[PDB]
Enzyme design. Structure first.
Site, PDB file in Angstrom:
ATOM      1  N   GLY A 146      26.829  64.932  84.661  1.00  8.42           N
ATOM      2  CA  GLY A 146      26.961  64.945  86.058  1.00  8.42           C
ATOM      3  C   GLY A 146      26.993  63.598  86.694  1.00  8.42           C
ATOM      4  O   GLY A 146      27.437  62.698  85.860  1.00  8.42           O
ATOM      5  N   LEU A 147      26.846  63.135  87.881  1.00  9.51           N
ATOM      6  CA  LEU A 147      26.776  61.997  88.753  1.00  9.51           C
ATOM      7  C   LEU A 147      28.256  61.486  88.727  1.00  9.51           C
ATOM      8  O   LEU A 147      28.380  60.439  89.114  1.00  9.51           O
ATOM      9  CB  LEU A 147      25.686  61.265  87.918  1.00  9.51           C
ATOM     10  CG  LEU A 147      25.350  59.550  88.101  1.00  9.51           C
ATOM     11  CD1 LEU A 147      25.406  59.124  89.600  1.00  9.51           C
ATOM     12  CD2 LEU A 147      24.145  58.847  87.633  1.00  9.51           C
ATOM     13  N   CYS A 148      29.198  62.203  87.938  1.00 11.95           N
ATOM     14  CA  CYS A 148      30.404  61.643  88.296  1.00 11.95           C
ATOM     15  C   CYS A 148      31.088  61.445  89.592  1.00 11.95           C
ATOM     16  O   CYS A 148      31.875  60.723  89.767  1.00 11.95           O
ATOM     17  CB  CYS A 148      31.509  62.576  87.176  1.00 11.95           C
ATOM     18  SG  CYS A 148      31.298  64.395  87.828  1.00 11.95           S
ATOM     19  N   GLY A 149      30.771  62.445  90.560  1.00 13.85           N
ATOM     20  CA  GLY A 149      31.145  62.647  92.036  1.00 13.85           C
ATOM     21  C   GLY A 149      31.759  63.713  92.239  1.00 13.85           C
ATOM     22  O   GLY A 149      31.239  64.775  91.555  1.00 13.85           O
ATOM     23  N   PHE A 156      34.209  65.672  90.993  1.00 14.50           N
ATOM     24  CA  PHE A 156      34.857  66.039  90.055  1.00 14.50           C
ATOM     25  C   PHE A 156      34.189  67.750  89.879  1.00 14.50           C
ATOM     26  O   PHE A 156      35.128  68.541  89.950  1.00 14.50           O
ATOM     27  CB  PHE A 156      34.684  65.384  88.867  1.00 14.50           C
ATOM     28  CG  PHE A 156      35.369  65.865  87.624  1.00 14.50           C
ATOM     29  CD1 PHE A 156      36.504  65.847  87.169  1.00 14.50           C
ATOM     30  CD2 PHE A 156      34.386  66.780  86.699  1.00 14.50           C
ATOM     31  CE1 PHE A 156      36.858  66.269  86.029  1.00 14.50           C
ATOM     32  CE2 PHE A 156      34.942  66.956  85.420  1.00 14.50           C
ATOM     33  CZ  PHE A 156      36.322  67.022  85.091  1.00 14.50           C
TER      34      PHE A 156
END
Ligand SMILES: Nc1ncnc2c1ncn2[C@@H]1O[C@H](COP(=O)(O)OP(=O)(O)OP(=O)(O)O)[C@@H](O)[C@H]1O
Ligand SMILES: Nc1ncnc2c1ncn2[C@@H]1O[C@H](COP(=O)(O)OP(=O)(O)OP(=O)(O)O)[C@@H](O)[C@H]1O
Lengths: 359, 271, 247, 131, 122, 72, 120, 72, 73
Positions: B87-90, B92
């Protein structure tokens, strides 16, 4: 150098005979701890130590006097004391009596020391004495003279000229902080008067690091003059590696993900920090200090573990004190870290680690 | 207590700043590793598709009828949504789910009755909690993406397709065309042409914009992806290969290799 | 401070020298003004400084000027209370200051003296129509090169190294050249550290950094500009190190 | 003279140096390779490999490949290649028993294609790990 | 709290407890915005063990039975150091992090843990 | 804060509201932390649900008094 | 703002509007530091609804037309409630957020959305 | 801000500066978050070449004023 | 109008004849430059400017007086 008996003090933030250097930091953080560590370390030397216990509990004073007596260091230490139950008058006076005693003994061509504990209680006593006399209050009720009051007594600790017998009083006062504030009136005043500062952050005190000296703020302005020739080299290597450790502190759990170089960097810095821990009232002499810092910063513990390295280093110190007494000869007679001394230390290191890996 | 709590909020917004720089740098380190891992599988698939082309010329005449490249009656389309397990990648994950819901909405009016495959933890958990989509199998990131995860998804779609259970199996994964815009392209995998060139979901043969081997560089203080089109190429052919082992069986041997390499490159490019 | 000021302004007024004044530092003067005024029983100003903060600052600063006789220039250190420029003592000191020279612990730890920080040194004199368009564009391009390299320290010097770009390698190389060239062997560092002193005039600094930038001195070693004076001394040091390279 | 070897996997390349003699199975039969062989394509199946080059024979546990031999080099493109020693033989016998059990729990085309696959998988892990 | 005043195992266990709590309170402003799936096993183990420890240092007092709703408790020093040896050394990381809430002895924490899990499984 | 506590309640509400405020403090503090999480356990998530139900039953409208029988 | 004065419907809509606005206000720190992708879908539903409300709370003035240029609009209470009901229902959440900016009635916002998709 | 700004601003400057205000406001908005969402649009590339260049034509040398003719 | 000679000021934030316009800004941000540009723009118009300078350095006001004389102002 005024040898302190702590690796961090004498290695990184060096205190010499004459330089003023206070211990700022929060309550119950190690100020009295290092203030007694210094005095108890002075037995190997010949100096005359002075403790000025201002406004204290009158029971901690009896406790630390019993410490100084049952440790033998009361053979030279004078401890003037004026507890909190005294008027503001005598609390204001007492550091000047300590300073006059140290001035006299310094003018007898003899090196001295003095500990002020604390200047905050002295300033509170003087502020009360002023406000009772209807002197106009200033910033946070402190009158406009606490700067002159503190500078007056702190400018008396000098390394006098070689025509006056090079006497030396090393004023090492203490000013506690509230909520981690050195920008208050009394802390700013004292850190502007004194030469260097030593920040004892209680966070490190709750983080196992004892003494909780915070190198990122603590700094002395004497520099290499308060370190012997055998010291300043490994002190430079240690400050290099420890700055490279602190700048890489954020990359904590990513050490496997790191580069192999930065992985060694983080692990060696951790070994250095675990070496930096040492118990209360356990002095280290200059042989012991240079042995510890050498074996630490040259990667001779990088095979070891972060838990064992304290037991490992005390056992290496015992082994090199008992089996190889010539290192003390070389260090205390030549004052330098020569090639033969370094190789003698490495061979002591090698045989001790070979015996200890079997254990 | 106001100044102390204000100093402590200052310290919190400092610690978060420095650890965000930390995650930035370790993420750029793993990006630089992943673009090398693309080259670690580059020569394999390179000479592999060169074989798949050059050996195909004398077998352009005869018909091999490989079950991997057969045409079943086109009814169903399976979908492997290739999300990362993170998670927290954006955008994506969310852009993947946008193209995913768009595909499983687009396939409902044609009368397709699709299915789904999930190979990211942050995606297969979403497909856990949504029972409406027919999920055949969940994949997580525990086995190694170098060989083991690639092989697991490979033999799983191979089992779904070579006993011809589901009709189609297609892939929904993104690329490294940029930093500021990832695009989840929808390429079909299991209905393949025997040449070595992938077809679109409709069979467009979209490899005209191949532009492979992304490697990161900087035109200025910031880094752009600089997609840096095709560098090298070394096929010729086999003059007389006079080969044994039943050319039908040879092409059915050469297809699953190329399939596993396609899935491996897909997982590397997604990561 | 007023003692030193009148002793300097005599030298200005009667000998027409170019006097150089040093008040190290102005914060002790402001603090002592506050403490005098606090003992005088005056009602203090906002943070606690004396009620007459600005006029006390002015009557010390505006005696330090340039007349038709001569010119007294002062370089006065400042301490800022907990790095708070919003405090009245710094915000009133800067009301009379013109430039700032923020020495770095970073260029001391790197080991290139003087240890100033070029990205943190400001001057009102650095304008085109004051010191020339040539000097202005040279300083601007040098700043931009160092500002490239400071962000590129994290990019390539830590991790990237992906043959960064030739247009970026050309900046990294000459940023190395310029960080070496910023140093100078001082006159009074000779007995201290072993560095014989050199004066480098302003036009020679501009021409030297001009040729470090302009794509004429990229081929020499990056140490051919470290601890050197003019630029001709730098090319000569390059030839002597290359004689030691052929040795 | 000595032909070259490239035991090439999708992710990595395991053996890239030379060899003088290899013996490897195929999808229909087996094949033996002498030095300087004709360009001969090879559909190698799931199975172990016999290799001989100034040493004893060693098993290379391969799991389905293709070898387009030309001159002086054999490009053994397998999706799964590994050496017979690194796979633990007790792990191989456990995999063997697990696969022989879990063959019979498959009762369909979707299921049997993951029954003989797993059975020959454990068998060709064993046929390496013993050797 | 000294080695030579309050015994060796007590001092080591007390400084170790303060150590792991300082670690958690340092970790807090990171795990706030970062998330819980982005820590390592040593770090998440520290977070869970500190979150057990903090609850275990809560005892229902004798005079607070009006405020808690529980009979009063009296814990020995032996029991407390036993509880912290057991919590820290690892042999109780399968107990619920509400099992250490308002329990006297580590035995009572284990019996409360059985109570919680039995009620949840019904 | 209530410094008198359950000696200011009748035995009925003293029984059923025994460890209520403390368990609600626990539920609030662990719901604040369960937002820092992705996947949890079903036991703790059911605990979060029951704490939410306890939280929802206490919204009382203005000019709407509840009697002690209704309350218990 | 009491249900005995303004009735049940008006006070209900006002209460839920303030609820969603505070939900966005609580999330604003997490949004400002990192952004919006990290949220749940049920949280971005409230963030989007309150981002539409925070713009529909503007209203051009009959006086301040000489500043902005947008002429003054008088809007009723009985239509403000219906506009906010159409916002909170979700019959308007598809059209963008700058559509609601500086309008009067709800049909001005819907015609604004229809209008800014003509000038391509 | 100018309270009485558009009153004293002449008709010529009014007619020429309305569109300047619109485009400069939208450029100050489009520069924020310019990279991720609106990177390769026709409108945003055009507005970058018309919002950097608007700011290019705003800047001026000190002590070199422009009378109203050069301004318009 | 009272035109200050700046494009931005006289464009989107105009100044009337009879309107206070506060030039608020940090230290060394160009406010003196704005004021001198306004005064120099009045070389023709019957705007009898007066520039009062409270508590400034003498070198600044001397340089501005020099500018005001040399620019025909
Ligand atoms: N290096 C150390 N190792 C272990 N314990 C230490 C160390 N230094 C200090 N302590 C412990 O910290 C406690 C407080 O120490 P100390 O009295 O020096 O703090 P303080 O700041 O002087 O306190 P106060 O503010 O009351 O004067 C003592 O109980 C002591 O045993
Ligand atoms: N538009 C401009 N073009 C070129 N230079 C400018 C411009 N505006 C300001 N400057 C320069 O910036 C410097 C500071 O500007 P200015 O003196 O107007 O600000 P200030 O607030 O008066 O500073 P201080 O109050 O410290 O004197 C001056 O040297 C001036 O020449």
């Amino acid at each position: 150098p005024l040898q302190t008996g702590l690796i961090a003090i004498d290695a990184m933030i060096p205190v010499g005979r004459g330089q003023r250097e206070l211990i700022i930091g929060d309550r119950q953080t190690g100020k009295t701890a290092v203030a007694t560590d210094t005095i108890l370390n002075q037995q190997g030397q010949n100096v005359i130590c002075v403790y000025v216990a201002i406004g204290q509990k009158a029971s901690s004073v009896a406790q630390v006097v019993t410490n100084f007596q049952e440790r033998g260091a009361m053979e030279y230490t004078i401890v003037v004391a004026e507890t909190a139950d005294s008027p503001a008058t005598l609390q204001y006076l007492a550091p000047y009596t300590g300073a006059a005693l140290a001035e006299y003994f310094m003018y007898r061509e003899r090196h001295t020391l003095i500990i002020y504990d604390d200047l905050s209680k002295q300033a509170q006593a003087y502020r009360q004495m002023s406000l009772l006399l209807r002197r106009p209050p200033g910033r946070e009720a402190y009158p406009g003279d606490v700067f002159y009051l503190h500078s007056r007594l702190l400018e008396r600790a000098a390394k006098l000229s070689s025509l006056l017998g090079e006497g030396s009083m090393t004023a090492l006062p203490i000013v506690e902080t509230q909520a981690g504030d050195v920008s208050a009136y009394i802390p700013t005043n004292v850190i502007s008067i004194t030469d260097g500062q030593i920040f004892l952050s209680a966070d490190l005190f709750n983080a196992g690091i004892r003494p909780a000296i915070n190198v990122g703020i603590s700094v002395s302005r004497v520099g290499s003059a308060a370190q012997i020739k055998a010291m300043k080299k490994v002190a430079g290597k240690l400050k290099l590696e420890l700055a490279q450790f602190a700048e890489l502190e954020a990359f904590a759990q990513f050490a496997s993900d790191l580069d192999k170089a930065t992985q060694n960097q983080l692990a060696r810095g951790q070994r250095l920090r675990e070496l930096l821990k040492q118990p209360q009232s356990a002095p280290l002499t200059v042989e012991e200090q240079v042995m510890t810092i050498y074996t630490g910063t040259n990667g001779y513990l990088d095979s070891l573990e972060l838990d064992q390295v304290r037991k490992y280093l005390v056992e290496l110190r015992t082994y090199v004190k008992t089996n190889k007494p010539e290192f003390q000869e070389i260090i205390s007679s030549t004052k330098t870290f020569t090639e033969e001394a370094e190789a003698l230390l490495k061979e002591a290191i090698q045989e001790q680690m070979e015996r200890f890996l079997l254990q | 207590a106001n100044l102390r709590e204000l100093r402590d909020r200052i310290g919190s917004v400092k610690n978060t700043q420095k650890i965000t720089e930390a995650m930035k740098l370790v993420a750029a380190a793993k990006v630089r590793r992943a673009q090398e891992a693309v080259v670690n599988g580059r020569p394999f698939s390179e000479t592999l598709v060169e074989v798949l082309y050059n050996m195909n010329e004398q077998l352009q005449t005869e018909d091999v009828d490989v079950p991997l490249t057969k045409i079943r009656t086109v009814k169903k389309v399976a979908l492997m949504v290739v999300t990362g397990d993170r998670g927290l990648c954006g955008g994506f994950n969310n852009m993947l789910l946008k193209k995913a819901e768009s595909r499983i909405a687009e396939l409902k009016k044609l009368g397709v009755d699709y299915t789904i495959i999930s190979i990211g933890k942050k995606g297969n958990t979403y497909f856990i909690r949504r029972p409406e989509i027919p999920v055949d199998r969940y994949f997580d990131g525990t086995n190694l993406p170098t060989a083991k995860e690639a092989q697991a998804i490979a033999d799983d779609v191979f089992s779904l397709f070579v006993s011809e259970e589901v009709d189609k199996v297609e892939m929904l994964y993104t690329k490294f065309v940029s930093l500021v815009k990832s695009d989840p392209v929808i390429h079909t995998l299991l209905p393949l042409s025997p040449k070595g060139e992938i077809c679109d979901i409709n069979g467009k043969c979209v490899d005209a914009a191949e532009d492979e081997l992304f490697r990161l560089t900087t035109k200025e203080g910031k880094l752009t992806v600089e997609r840096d089109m095709i560098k090298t190429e070394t096929p010729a052919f086999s003059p007389i290969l006079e080969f044994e082992q039943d050319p039908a069986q040879i092409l059915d041997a050469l297809l699953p290799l190329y399939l596993n390499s396609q899935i491996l490159r897909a997982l590397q490019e997604s990561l | 401070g007023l003692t030193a000021l009148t002793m300097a302004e005599y030298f200005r007024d009667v000998n027409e020298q170019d006097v150089l004044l040093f008040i190290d530092n102005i914060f002790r003067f402001v603090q002592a003004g506050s403490e005098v005024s606090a003992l005088l029983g005056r009602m203090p100003s906002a943070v606690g400084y004396q009620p007459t903060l600005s006029t006390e600052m002015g009557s010390l600063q505006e005696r330090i000027t340039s007349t038709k006789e001569g010119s007294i220039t002062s370089i006065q250190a400042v301490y800022v209370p907990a790095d708070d420029l919003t405090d009245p003592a710094p915000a009133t000191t800067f009301a009379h200051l013109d430039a700032t020279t923020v020495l770095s612990r970073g260029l001391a730890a790197k080991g290139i003296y003087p240890a100033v920080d070029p990205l943190d040194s400001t001057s009102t004199m650095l304008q085109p129509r004051i010191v020339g368009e040539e000097h202005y564009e040279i300083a601007q391009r040098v700043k931009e090169t160092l500002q490239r390299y400071k962000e590129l320290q994290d990019i390539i010097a830590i991790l990237g190294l992906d043959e960064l770009s030739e247009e970026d390698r050309l900046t990294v190389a000459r940023a190395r050249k310029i960080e070496r060239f910023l140093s100078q062997p001082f006159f009074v560092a000779e007995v201290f550290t072993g560095s014989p002193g050199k004066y480098v005039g302003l036009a020679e600094t501009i021409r030297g950094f001009q040729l470090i930038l302009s794509g004429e001195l990229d081929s020499l070693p990056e140490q051919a500009f470290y601890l050197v004076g003019n630029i001709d001394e730098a090319t000569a040091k390059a030839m002597n190190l290359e004689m030691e390279s052929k040795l | 003279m000595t032909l070259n070897l490239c035991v090439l996997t999708p992710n990595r390349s395991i053996w890239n140096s030379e060899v003088k003699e290899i013996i490897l199975s195929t999808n229909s039969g087996q094949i033996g390779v002498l030095p300087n062989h004709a360009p001969t394509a090879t559909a190698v199946d799931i199975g172990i490999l016999r290799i001989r080059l100034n040493d004893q024979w060693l098993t290379l546990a391969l799991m389905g490949g293709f070898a387009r031999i030309g001159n002086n080099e054999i490009t053994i493109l397998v999706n799964d290649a590994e050496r017979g020693s690194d796979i633990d033989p007790q792990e191989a016998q456990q995999t063997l028993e697990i696969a022989e059990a879990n063959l019979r729990k498959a009762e369909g085309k979707r299921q049997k294609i993951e029954a003989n696959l797993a059975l020959r998988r454990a068998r060709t892990r064993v046929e390496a790990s013993n050797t």
